[PDB]
Amino acid sequence: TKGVNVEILQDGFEVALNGVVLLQHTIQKPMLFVGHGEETIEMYRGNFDIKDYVTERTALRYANVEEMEGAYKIDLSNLKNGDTMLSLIVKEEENRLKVEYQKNDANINRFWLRVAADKQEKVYGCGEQLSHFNMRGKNFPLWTSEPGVGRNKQTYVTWQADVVDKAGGDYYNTNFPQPTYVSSKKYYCHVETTAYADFDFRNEAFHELQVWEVPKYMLFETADTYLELVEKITGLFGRQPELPEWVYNGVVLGIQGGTDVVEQKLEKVLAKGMKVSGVWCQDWQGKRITSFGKRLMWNWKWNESEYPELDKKIAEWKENDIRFLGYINPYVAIEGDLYKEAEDKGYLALNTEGNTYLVDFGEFYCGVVDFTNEEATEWYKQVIKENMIDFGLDGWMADFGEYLPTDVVLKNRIDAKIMHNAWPTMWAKVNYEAVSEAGKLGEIVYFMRAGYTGIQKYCTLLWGGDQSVDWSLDDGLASVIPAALSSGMIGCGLHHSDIGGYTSLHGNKRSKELLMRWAEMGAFTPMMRTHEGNRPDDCFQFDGDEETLEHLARMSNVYVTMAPYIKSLVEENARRGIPVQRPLFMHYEEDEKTYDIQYQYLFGEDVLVAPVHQENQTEWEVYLPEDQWVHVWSGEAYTGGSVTVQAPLGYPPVFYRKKSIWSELFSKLIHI
Amino acid sequence: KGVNVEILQDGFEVALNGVVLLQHTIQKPMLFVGHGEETIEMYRGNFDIKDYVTERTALRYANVEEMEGAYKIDLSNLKNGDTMLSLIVKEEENRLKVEYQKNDANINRFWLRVAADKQEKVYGCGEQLSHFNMRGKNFPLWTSEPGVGRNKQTYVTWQADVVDKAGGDYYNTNFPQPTYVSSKKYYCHVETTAYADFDFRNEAFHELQVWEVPKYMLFETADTYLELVEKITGLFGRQPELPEWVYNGVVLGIQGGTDVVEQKLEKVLAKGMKVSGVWCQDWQGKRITSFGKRLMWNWKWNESEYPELDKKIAEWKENDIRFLGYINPYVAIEGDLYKEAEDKGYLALNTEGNTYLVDFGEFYCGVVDFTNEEATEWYKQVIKENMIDFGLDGWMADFGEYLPTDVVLKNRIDAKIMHNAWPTMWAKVNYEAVSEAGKLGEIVYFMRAGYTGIQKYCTLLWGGDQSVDWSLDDGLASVIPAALSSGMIGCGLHHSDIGGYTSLHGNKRSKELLMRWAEMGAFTPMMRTHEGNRPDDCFQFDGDEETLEHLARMSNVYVTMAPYIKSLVEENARRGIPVQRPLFMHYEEDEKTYDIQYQYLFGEDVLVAPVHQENQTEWEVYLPEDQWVHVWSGEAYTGGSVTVQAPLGYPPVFYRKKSIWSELFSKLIHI
Ligand SMILES: *[C@@H]1[C@@H](N)[C@H](CS(=O)(=O)O)[C@@H](O)[C@H](O)[C@H]1O
Ligand SMILES: *[C@@H]1[C@@H](N)[C@H](CS(=O)(=O)O)[C@@H](O)[C@H](O)[C@H]1O
Ligand SMILES: [K+]
Ligand SMILES: [K+]
Numbered sequence A: 001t002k003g004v005n006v007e008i009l010q011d012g013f014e015v016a017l018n019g020v021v022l023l024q025h026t027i028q029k030p031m032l033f034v035g036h037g038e039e040t041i042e043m044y045r046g047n048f049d050i051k052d053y054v055t056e057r058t059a060l061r062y063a064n065v066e067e068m069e070g071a072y073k074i075d076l077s078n079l080k081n082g083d084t085m086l087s088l089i090v091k092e093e094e095n096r097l098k099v100e101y102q103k104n105d106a107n108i109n110r111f112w113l114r115v116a117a118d119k120q121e122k123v124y125g126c127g128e129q130l131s132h133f134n135m136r137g138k139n140f141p142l143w144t145s146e147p148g149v150g151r152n153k154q155t156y157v158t159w160q161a162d163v164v165d166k167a168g169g170d171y172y173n174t175n176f177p178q179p180t181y182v183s184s185k186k187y188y189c190h191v192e193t194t195a196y197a198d199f200d201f202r203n204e205a206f207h208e209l210q211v212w213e214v215p216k217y218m219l220f221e222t223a224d225t226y227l228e229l230v231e232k233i234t235g236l237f238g239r240q241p242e243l244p245e246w247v248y249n250g251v252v253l254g255i256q257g258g259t260d261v262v263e264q265k266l267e268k269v270l271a272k273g274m275k276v277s278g279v280w281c282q283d284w285q286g287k288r289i290t291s292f293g294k295r296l297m298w299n300w301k302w303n304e305s306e307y308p309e310l311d312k313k314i315a316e317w318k319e320n321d322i323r324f325l326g327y328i329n330p331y332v333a334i335e336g337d338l339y340k341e342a343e344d345k346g347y348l349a350l351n352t353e354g355n356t357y358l359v360d361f362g363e364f365y366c367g368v369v370d371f372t373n374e375e376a377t378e379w380y381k382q383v384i385k386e387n388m389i390d391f392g393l394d395g396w397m398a399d400f401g402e403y404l405p406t407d408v409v410l411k412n413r414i415d416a417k418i419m420h421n422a423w424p425t426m427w428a429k430v431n432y433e434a435v436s437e438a439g440k441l442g443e444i445v446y447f448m449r450a451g452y453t454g455i456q457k458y459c460t461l462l463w464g465g466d467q468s469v470d471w472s473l474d475d476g477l478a479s480v481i482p483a484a485l486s487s488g489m490i491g492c493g494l495h496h497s498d499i500g501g502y503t504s505l506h507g508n509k510r511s512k513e514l515l516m517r518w519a520e521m522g523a524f525t526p527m528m529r530t531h532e533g534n535r536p537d538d539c540f541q542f543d544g545d546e547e548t549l550e551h552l553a554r555m556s557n558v559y560v561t562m563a564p565y566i567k568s569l570v571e572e573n574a575r576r577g578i579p580v581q582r583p584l585f586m587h588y589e590e591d592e593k594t595y596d597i598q599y600q601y602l603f604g605e606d607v608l609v610a611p612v613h614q615e616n617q618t619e620w621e622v623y624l625p626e627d628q629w630v631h632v633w634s635g636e637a638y639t640g641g642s643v644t645v646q647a648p649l650g651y652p653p654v655f656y657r658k659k660s661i662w663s664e665l666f667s668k669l670i671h672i
Numbered sequence B: 001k002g003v004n005v006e007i008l009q010d011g012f013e014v015a016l017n018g019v020v021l022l023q024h025t026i027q028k029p030m031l032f033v034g035h036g037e038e039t040i041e042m043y044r045g046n047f048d049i050k051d052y053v054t055e056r057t058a059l060r061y062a063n064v065e066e067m068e069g070a071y072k073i074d075l076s077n078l079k080n081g082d083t084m085l086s087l088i089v090k091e092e093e094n095r096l097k098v099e100y101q102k103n104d105a106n107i108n109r110f111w112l113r114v115a116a117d118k119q120e121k122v123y124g125c126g127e128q129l130s131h132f133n134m135r136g137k138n139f140p141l142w143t144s145e146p147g148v149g150r151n152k153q154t155y156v157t158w159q160a161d162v163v164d165k166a167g168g169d170y171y172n173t174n175f176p177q178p179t180y181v182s183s184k185k186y187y188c189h190v191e192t193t194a195y196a197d198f199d200f201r202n203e204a205f206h207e208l209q210v211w212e213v214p215k216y217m218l219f220e221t222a223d224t225y226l227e228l229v230e231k232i233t234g235l236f237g238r239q240p241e242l243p244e245w246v247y248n249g250v251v252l253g254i255q256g257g258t259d260v261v262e263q264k265l266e267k268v269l270a271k272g273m274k275v276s277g278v279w280c281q282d283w284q285g286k287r288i289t290s291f292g293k294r295l296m297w298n299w300k301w302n303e304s305e306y307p308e309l310d311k312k313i314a315e316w317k318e319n320d321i322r323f324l325g326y327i328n329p330y331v332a333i334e335g336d337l338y339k340e341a342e343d344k345g346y347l348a349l350n351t352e353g354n355t356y357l358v359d360f361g362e363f364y365c366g367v368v369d370f371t372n373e374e375a376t377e378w379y380k381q382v383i384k385e386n387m388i389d390f391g392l393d394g395w396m397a398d399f400g401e402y403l404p405t406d407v408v409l410k411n412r413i414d415a416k417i418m419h420n421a422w423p424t425m426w427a428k429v430n431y432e433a434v435s436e437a438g439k440l441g442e443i444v445y446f447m448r449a450g451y452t453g454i455q456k457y458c459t460l461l462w463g464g465d466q467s468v469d470w471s472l473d474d475g476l477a478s479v480i481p482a483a484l485s486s487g488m489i490g491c492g493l494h495h496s497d498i499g500g501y502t503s504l505h506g507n508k509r510s511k512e513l514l515m516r517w518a519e520m521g522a523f524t525p526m527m528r529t530h531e532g533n534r535p536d537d538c539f540q541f542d543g544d545e546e547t548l549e550h551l552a553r554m555s556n557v558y559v560t561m562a563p564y565i566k567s568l569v570e571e572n573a574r575r576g577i578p579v580q581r582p583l584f585m586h587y588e589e590d591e592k593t594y595d596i597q598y599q600y601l602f603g604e605d606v607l608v609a610p611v612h613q614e615n616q617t618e619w620e621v622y623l624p625e626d627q628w629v630h631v632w633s634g635e636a637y638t639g640g641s642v643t644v645q646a647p648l649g650y651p652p653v654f655y656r657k658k659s660i661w662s663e664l665f666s667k668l669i670h671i
Helices: A156-165 A226-237 A245-249 A259-271 A310-319 A337-345 A374-389 A423-437 A477-489 A512-522 A546-576 A592-596 A663-671 B155-164 B225-236 B244-248 B258-270 B309-318 B336-344 B373-388 B422-436 B476-488 B511-521 B545-575 B591-595 B662-670
Strands: A004-008 A012-017 A020-026 A032-037 A040-044 A047-051 A054-059 A062-067 A072-077 A086-093 A096-103 A110-116 A123-127 A139-142 A177-183 A187-192 A197-200 A206-211 A217-222 A251-254 A276-280 A287-290 A293-296 A323-328 A331-333 A358-360 A365-368 A395-398 A445-447 A601-603 A607-609 A619-624 A629-631 A641-646 A654-657 B003-007 B011-016 B019-025 B031-036 B039-043 B046-050 B053-058 B061-066 B071-076 B085-092 B095-102 B109-115 B122-126 B138-141 B176-182 B186-191 B196-199 B205-210 B216-221 B250-253 B275-279 B286-289 B292-295 B322-327 B330-332 B357-359 B364-367 B394-397 B444-446 B600-602 B606-608 B618-623 B628-630 B640-645 B653-656
Touching: A004 A062, A004 A086, A012 A062, A012 A096, A012 A217, A020 A110, A020 A187, A032 B053, A054 A110, A054 B031, A123 A139, A123 A477, A139 A177, A177 A197, A177 A206, A177 A226, A187 A206, A187 A226, A217 A226, A226 A477, A226 A546, A245 A276, A245 A546, A251 A259, A251 A546, A259 A276, A259 A310, A259 A546, A276 A395, A310 A323, A323 A374, A331 A337, A337 A365, A337 A374, A374 A423, A395 A423, A477 A512, A477 A601, A512 A546, A546 A663, A654 A663, B003 B085, B011 B061, B011 B095, B011 B216, B019 B109, B019 B186, B053 B109, B122 B138, B122 B476, B138 B176, B176 B196, B176 B205, B176 B225, B186 B205, B186 B225, B216 B225, B225 B476, B225 B545, B244 B275, B244 B545, B250 B258, B250 B545, B258 B275, B258 B309, B258 B545, B275 B394, B309 B322, B322 B373, B330 B336, B336 B364, B336 B373, B373 B422, B394 B422, B476 B511, B476 B600, B511 B545, B545 B662, B653 B662
Parallel strands: A251 A276, A276 A323, A323 A395, A395 A445, B250 B275, B275 B322, B322 B394, B394 B444
Antiparallel strands: A004 A012, A012 A020, A032 A054, A032 A110, A040 A047, A054 B053, A062 A072, A072 A086, A086 A096, A096 A217, A110 A206, A123 A177, A139 A197, A177 A187, A187 A217, A197 A206, A287 A293, A331 A365, A358 A365, A601 A607, A607 A654, A619 A641, A629 A654, B003 B011, B011 B019, B031 B053, B031 B109, B039 B046, B061 B071, B071 B085, B085 B095, B095 B216, B109 B205, B122 B176, B138 B196, B176 B186, B186 B216, B196 B205, B286 B292, B330 B364, B357 B364, B600 B606, B606 B653, B618 B640, B628 B653
16 A cells, blocks of 8 residues: 555556556556657757657567566566567655666667556646646647747747747747656656657546657656645755845846946836846847847857946945846857857867857857866856856846757767757756855846756746747736746746746737736746846837836835745745745645636735736636635635636735735735 | 569569569568557548557568469568568559558558659649649648648638638648659559558658558559550549530639529620630529528529529520539538438438538538448439439539548448548549430539549549639649649549639739639630639629630630640540640650649640739740740740740740641731
8 A cells, every 4th residue: 555566467567656556557558668760850049840750669568577676577578478678677766666667679769658547637747838737638749949939820929930930839839848747646757868758648548658768767756735746846856945035125127228227227216116126137248139139149248338337336236235137048159259268178069070060049150068068067157157156146047058959969979869958957057056166055046947857956046938928828928827837846936927028029019008917927926027028119118107117116015015925935945845836726635626727826825816817907707715815905805716806907816815824914915 | 574573681672664663671671550549620621630659560571472473472570470461462454463461450550661762753642732743741641621721821821720720731632542653654553542641751762651451552664654644544544525515615604693694695705705605503592601602502403593594504505605503412401402311311320320410611411421322323313303404514513522530321331431432432423424314525524522533433623712812822823733733643634713712811813813814724624714702802704894805815715726625635535644744744854844833734735834923924934845936926945944925815835836736826826
C-alpha cells in the first residue's frame, strides 16, 4: 500500500506508488513503444517549424519481470521471447518511483510511454502554458522558442504574423516548456531529458509521453494535497530566493530614451504620489531601431552618449530609495566589442565550417556565447560582475535563451537537438552564479521569460514575456493568468507580466483602457513593472494622460499597502515552494468547478483575484468557492457561487476571506 | 523486355523494360506495414483528417521463390520471421503487376517506397489545382470540397477557414486518384478506394501510403508520353466524342426562368455571338441561402419557375440551340424524390437505422445509396424520365464528394472505403442512363468530382468552383494545372466556368476577369458561362456592350477553330491523348517544359499561355524550339522567352507554321 508495488498479473504487470496505479502493461494494451524518426527543423528568428517523419514505431508487448535487491528489472520486446529492445529498472529512491531506461539498438531515437488515466483526470504544468492550464484533450510539443504573436490561427494578428514573419505560433508554443506534468490524481511525473518531447493528453485511457531519445529516467511522486505536491516538486527541482526588500516599495517604471527623460518622468510621477521601487531602462547599453520598432544594441556595457551621467545618477536615485535595473541577453551583436572579444577568445558557438555561427534576430545578426565552454561561461559572468553589478544595477531583464539553432556546433560536442532546450537553464545559472558569487543573492533580482527544468532554482523571477497589446485570450492580458498558474504548479512560484503588454504589430496598438486594466492585475502579483513596448509612440503609456497617471499611482498604493501580505507569500514560496499565484483547486480540492478555472487565481490563501480581461466592461462575473468572502472595495460579503460585481476602472474584482489573519490590512483598501 | 526480378546479396530489384522500379535491401527496405487510428470530421464537404499511428513495421527481410512465370515474395521484420506481407510479382498484359496479401487483421496502414532520382518529376494524382509537378510535397487523396482560396497565406482562404472551415490547401481536390506518371516514362496505379497519401518529399524514393493493404498495383512503361497516356487510357478507359452541336459555340449559363432565357438569347444573337445552347441549372427550381442563389435538389422540371419549358426546348432546338440542366446524387428533404426514396429504402442510413441527413449548408439532403442496385436503377430511370425524355441535351452532374465516414450503406462496406468510390459510381449512373437510352455522343454531362475509372464514365470534366479572382491557387490560373494533371491520368476533356463561381469574403467578379476567362475558354473543348453563387455581385456576359462583343468575338474564334478542336476530341476518343497537353508531351528534350503549368498545348499545333493576372497589357511566354506564329499579328517566332502584347481580346496564342491547319489558323488575323 506504501511505496513501490510491482504486481505481476497473467496479462502483464502494474507499477504503483502509495497505491496510486501509474504504469499498466498488458500484451494487448502495451505501455511502451520505441522507434525511429527523421525530423526536419527549420528556424526563422526564434520560430521553429518542426516536422517528424516516423519510419518505425514498435509496440513492446512482451515483458519479463525479475524481482531483485528491492528493485525490479523488466525486459521488453516486440515478440514473445524476442531480443530485448528496452530494459527498465523500477525502484523506490528518495521516496519516489524511479524508472531507469536502457536501450540496446542505436537506431532507436523515438520513445513513447503510456501512463494510465481516467476520463475525468486533469493535467497541469509542462512549464509556462499561455493557452491551456488544464492540458487534457490536446498534445503539447515541448521545445523552447518564440511563443508566437497572437497564438491562434483564427485571429487576424496571428494570420499576419504567419504571413509576414512566420511568427504566429499556436496554443502549445512557449519560452518555457518542461517535461513535467501534475495530475489531478495527486502525483507529478518528470522525464529527465532535454530532448524534444510531446506530451499527448488526447486519449481518455492514457497520457502518452513522446521523447526524441530514450530518456535516462523518470521520477514519480505522490502527495495527499496539492500544497504538499508542489512542496515535493520544488524539493526536486529547487526553490527561488526571497525577493529583495526594495521590490515592495512599488512600481518598477519601464522608461527609455536617456537620463534626462528618466529623471523628468520620475519627478512627475513622484509628485502625483506614485510609489516607485525603481526605474528599468532596457536601453542603458544602447538602442537599435529596426522595422520591428525600438529594439536594443546587444552589447552589455553602459552607453555614455545615450545615458549621460548614469554612473552618478544611479547612486543619486538610490539615496532617494529608487533602484535601477538594466538588460542583458545571452547573445552578442557583431558590431560590438563583446562579440569581437568573444570571437578572439573562442567563446562563441561555431558552424560546421568552423567559424562563428551567426543567428538572425531580425535585421541584425549576433553570436551565441557558448555556455558549454566553462571558460566562456566564467567570462560572461565576469562581464555581468564588471559592467552590471559593479556599475550598481539592482537588477535586470535577462531576456531570451530560446534561439539555439539545431545545426550549431558547441564546445562540449553534444548535439544541438539536445542542447537547445537546456540553454534557458544554463542561461539562468549564469545569472544566478554571477549574483551569488558577488554576494548579492537576496539584493539583486533578474527576471527571465525562457526556461526549462531547473530554473526553479536558477531563475529569481519569471515574467510572461511578450504579450500582444490586446484583449485576446491566447496572447493578450488574459494569457498571463494560465502562464502564472501553469508555471507555479511545476515549481516556478514568482511570476509577473509587462503592465500593458509589449507587442504592437499588424494594427494592434495599446489603448488607455488596456494599460489600466493590466495595472489592476499587476498590483496583485509579486512585482509591478511597466514596459513601453516595441513601438512606444504607437502605444498608450502611463503618462499618456492625467487619469492614467493617477490610476497607476493609485494601484501602486494598493500594492504597497498589501506589501506585508505579499512578502509573507514570497517567503512561503521560498520556504515550501508554494506559489504566490495559486489555482483555486489548491485550496478548494473538493470543488469540481475549480479544476477548470484559469482566468482566476488565489493570491496566497486569503485573496481571490478575477481580473477584467475584456474591453469595455463595467462589471464582471466571478466564481467564488464556498468560504466567507469580502469584496475588497465595497466591504460587501459573499458566500460561494457565481456572482456579478461592479468593476469600474480602478476597482478590479478582488475578494479576501473574512477568516484571514490579515483582515485588518485588507480592510484599509475600502478607503483607497 | 518485361519483368526481371534480380536477386541481390542483401535483397532484390524489380525492373520493367529496363526501368528499375522497386528496390529492397535489409538496410533500405521498400515496404512498411502498421496500425493507425484516424479521426475524420466532416463539415459541409470539408474533411479534417488526422492520423494517430501506433505501429509502423519495416519489412526488412524478404524470401523470394519462383513459380509459373510469377515470383512469390514473403516479407517480415526479422530474418526468417513470421510473414506479415506476401507479394506475387508477375507480368500481366505487358504490365508489372504486384499483388499483396496480409495475414494480420490489425494491419490497416501500408507504405511502399518506389525508387526515384533527385531530378525526377511526377504528374497526375487526379485533378490537381495548385501543383502539376508534385515533386517535393505530399498529396492526401480524399475526394472533398477543394477549398475556397486553397492557400493559407491569402485573406480569402483565412476567412473561408474562420467562417466556414472551408479554405482547404494545395492538395485538396474533388478528383484525387492513386495514380501518378513519372518523368522516367512509367505510370504507377494503386488499386484501392481507401484514403491514400502519395509522398514525394524524399529525393531517393516516392512513398505511397494507403489506409489498407491494396489488392494490387500496376506499372507500365512507354517510349513517349504520347504512348504512355495511350496505355493509361487503355487501362482505365476512354471518353466518347463530344456531340457535334457543342462546336456551334458558347453554352450560356442563365438563370431566372423562360422569359429571361428568351431575352438574353435575343440580345446575344443580335450581337453575332455563336451559341451552342443554354444551360439553366435552376430548371428544377431555385433556393436562396446566405451563400447566394442555390438550387432545390429535386430533379424534375419546375413548371412555375420555368413555364412552357417543354415547348420552348423544342422551339430552341429548331433554331439550333440546345438545352442543358442539372442533377446531383443527393435529394432534398422537402422534395418528392426524397420521400419516394425513403419509402423504397433507397437512401443511406445512420447507425440508428434512419435516413442519414447531410448538411449541405443551411439545408439537408439524403444520399441515394448507389451500393443498392435497385436504388441505382431507380435513379437512372429518374434521369431517363425527367431529363433525357424531357429533351435535355446535357447537364451538370455536380458533387459526389460528400459521403460521410459514419454512413451505413446497403453493401455494409465501411464508408472509409466507399467515400472515394462514390464519384465513379455517380459517373457510372450518368453514363448508363445515357448509354441505355442510345444517346452516347448526343447527350453530354459534365462533372467536377472523380476517382479511378471516370476515364470511361465521365463524358466531360469541369474544374468546379474557382474563386472569382486572379489568385494562383483558386482563380483563373488554377484551371490550367487542373486540365494538365487530369489529362496525364486519362481525363482528356476539360473546361471551366467562364468567370469562375465563388463570390465570398469580398471577392466579386470583375468585367476584366470574365473577359480574360472567355479568352482561355475559347481554347478548350467547351465554352460555358456561369452566373456564379451571387449573380448580382458578379459581372455577367450581358453586363455591358464591350463585354457582350468580347464574348461574341471569342465565340467566333472557337467556332472558326471547330474543325481542329473536333480532330483533337476525336484523337482523345481514339488514343486517349488529351486535348490540353503539357509542353513536354511534344518537346520531350526541353528541360524547362517539365515545370510549366500555366501554359498548355492545344493539340499538337497550338500553344496557349492565358493571361491570368489583372491589369496586364502584355505577357511573357515560353516557346519551345519550333517555327511559331502569333495568332493575332502573324509575327513569326522561334524558341525562347518572349513578351507579346495581349490586350483584352488578344490572348497569347501561337500556332506552328508546319501545321496542316495553318490555312485555318490564318483566318484568326481577321476575326
Ligand atoms: C526580449 C526582447 N524581445 C526585447 C528586447 S530587444 O532588444 O530584443 O528589442 C525586450 O524589450 C522584451 O521585453 C523581451 O521579451
Ligand atoms: C455545384 C454546386 N456548388 C452548384 C449548385 S448548388 O445548388 O449547390 O448551388 C453549382 O452551381 C456549381 O456550379 C457546382 O460546383
Ligand atoms: K507573444
Ligand atoms: K475552389
